[PDB]
Structures are given as C-alpha cells and as structure tokens.
Design a protein around this ligand. Structure first.
Ligand code: T6T
Length: 303
C-alpha cells in the first residue's frame, strides 16, 4: 500500500451473476485496497467446470502473483489448478474446495492449495433444519431443494440438514429435488412436490437460486405462509419475501469476509508469512423482525 510490494491477486468465482460471488468480490477489493494489491477478476456465466477451466487458463496466462478460486468441481479442477501450482503460482480456494478441502497435509492429489476459506457448510445445513423445524412446529413433510450432487458446499448443507432432521421423529424428509442451479426449475419442482403432497409443510433451499425458486414456486401455488421456506443466502429479495411471510428465515453467509480474508491471506503468504489451512466464516440468520436491525441488514448481499 505504502511501502508494500504491490501484488496482482486473481479471483475466479463459481458464477459471475451470483450475488454471493459479487459480494465476495466486494470484500476482496476492500482487502486489496488495504494492502495495496490489484484484483484480477474473471469468471464464467455458469457454475460449470467446462466453462470455468478456460477462464482459469486465461488467468494463469496473466501471471498473477496468487489465485483465489471457487472450484466448480472437487475433482475436475484438480489437474487444471495443479498446472498453476507447478508454474509456481500459489492459491487459495474460497467457498468450495478441491480434493477433500484438507490442504498442506503432505498427501493427496488436491493438497497443494494453501488454504480453504468458506462457511461451515455442514453447520449451515443443521441451522437450516432447526430453523425449518421451528417454522413447521416440529412435524410434517419437508424436502431439500438443491443444486446438483457433488457440489461440495451444497452437498455439505444437505448432509447437515438431513443429519439434524433425523433427530426430529415427527418430520418426514422427502426426496431432494435437484435444479441444476436454476430457480425456475426449483419453482416447478415445488409445484410437483406440492401437487403430490397437498400436506407439504416446508422446504429448504440449499443455495441462493434453490431458495429463490422454491419461494417463487410457493408464491405461484398460492401457498405463501402455509408452506414454510428456509432459504440459504441473502439476496436483496429476502427483504420483501420475509416481510410478506413468503420465507421465514434466510441464512446469510458472509461472502465479503471470505473474499477479504482470501486476499489478506494471499498477501501474507506472498510476504513470507504462514497462513491457516482453514478459515471458517459465519452465518447471520435473518428473519422478519431483525432484517431491519442495522447490524443484520448489512449482511444482505450486494447486487
Ligand atoms: O449464492 C449461491 C452460491 O454461490 O451457490 C454456490 C455455493 O457454493 C455458494 O456458497 C452460494 O450458496
């Protein structure tokens, strides 16, 4: 910044048009300004390793000093990132991981990133389950609206949700509906589940798009406030949807925190400081009442 070496740190999101990654980027720019770095930001328009890897390659060719990336596949991003590693480029994964997400252990094929910075996503799921159980009075039929098997974060949220719900004997967990990150698909799946199950009590959307689509489906079905919704992430729409009763809880991650600590950790590494192999960022649970608490509303995602 002042006497600091000025670095070029790349940030590759999972998806460009996603308020989570947009807000992560905001946090990253704030940290970059603080320690004198420039962010090289580039992403694909879908959460998809086929389109993310060419972006990663374009970024590698810009010879950044470090790479922050949210890999869109735990296995298919390993060898492409390994190329960056072998070219001397240090990296951190944000939000999602490659391998197991256990890094610098000295073994395994996806061991070379320096750190994994993300929410505690299993906990996120357990929190969503407890919130939904509260909303439905601890009985009735529910299901998880999710993206696609194999996405590390949403896999963990579904596991945490199901393990928590197993402790609630009056609750029935119906089959997970996978929407491939498409809110309109999630809405149509809500409609199908509700048509087969007029007694459906609630739904947990395990990421932004799943929650938005599921909520939109409930509204279109005429069941706002009757079918309870717990939505992961906190796009701007949660203000109106909490107010109207369409969703009961939004589980906000802290993407700016993820971005911020990603850039600072890269800077620390580049100046010879050891960094943690894991940093876990928290949640803010937003409801109808506290969404106007200032300390809370500031966690609603940008854009
Ligand atoms: O906002 C949606 C989102 O980006 O979907 C993928 C997840 O890995 C992110 O944590 C976030 O839920």
């Amino acid at each position: 910044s002042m006497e600091n070496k000025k670095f070029r740190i790349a940030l590759i999101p999972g998806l460009t048009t996603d308020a989570f990654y947009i807000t992560m980027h905001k946090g990253a720019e704030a940290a970059a300004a603080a320690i004198g770095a420039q962010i090289i930001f580039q992403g694909a328009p879908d959460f998809n390793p086929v389109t993310q890897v060419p972006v990663l390659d374009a970024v590698i060719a810009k010879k950044p000093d470090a790479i922050l990336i949210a890999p869109t596949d735990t296995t298919q991003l390993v060898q492409p990132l390994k190329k960056a590693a072998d070219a001397g480029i240090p990296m951190i994964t944000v939000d999602t991981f490659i391998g197991t997400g256990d890094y610098q252990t000295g073994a395994g094929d996806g061991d070379f990133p320096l750190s994994y910075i993300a929410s505690d996503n299993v906990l996120g799921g357990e929190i969503a389950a407890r919130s939904l159980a509260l909303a439905i009075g601890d009985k009735g039929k529910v299901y998880v609206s999710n993206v696609k098997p194999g996405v590390s974060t949403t896999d963990q949220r579904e596991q945490g949700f199901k393990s928590e719900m197993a402790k609630h004997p009056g609750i029935t967990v119906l089959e997970t509906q996978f929407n491939d990150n498409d809110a309109n698909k999630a809405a149509s799946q809500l409609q199908a589940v509700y048509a087969r199950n007029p007694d459906l009590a609630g739904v947990f959307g395990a990421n932004l798009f799943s929650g938005l689509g599921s909520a939109n489906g409930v509204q279109q079905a005429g069941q706002s406030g009757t079918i309870k919704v717990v939505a992961f992430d906190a796009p701007g729409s949660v203000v109106d949807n909490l107010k109207s009763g369409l969703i009961d809880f939004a589980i906000a991650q802290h993407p700016a925190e993820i971005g911020y600590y990603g850039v600072i950790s890269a800077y620390a590494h580049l100046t010879g400081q050891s960094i943690p192999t894991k940093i876990g960022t928290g949640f803010t649970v937003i409801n109808k009442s506290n969404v106007t608490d200032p300390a809370v509303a500031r966690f609603i995602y940008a854009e």
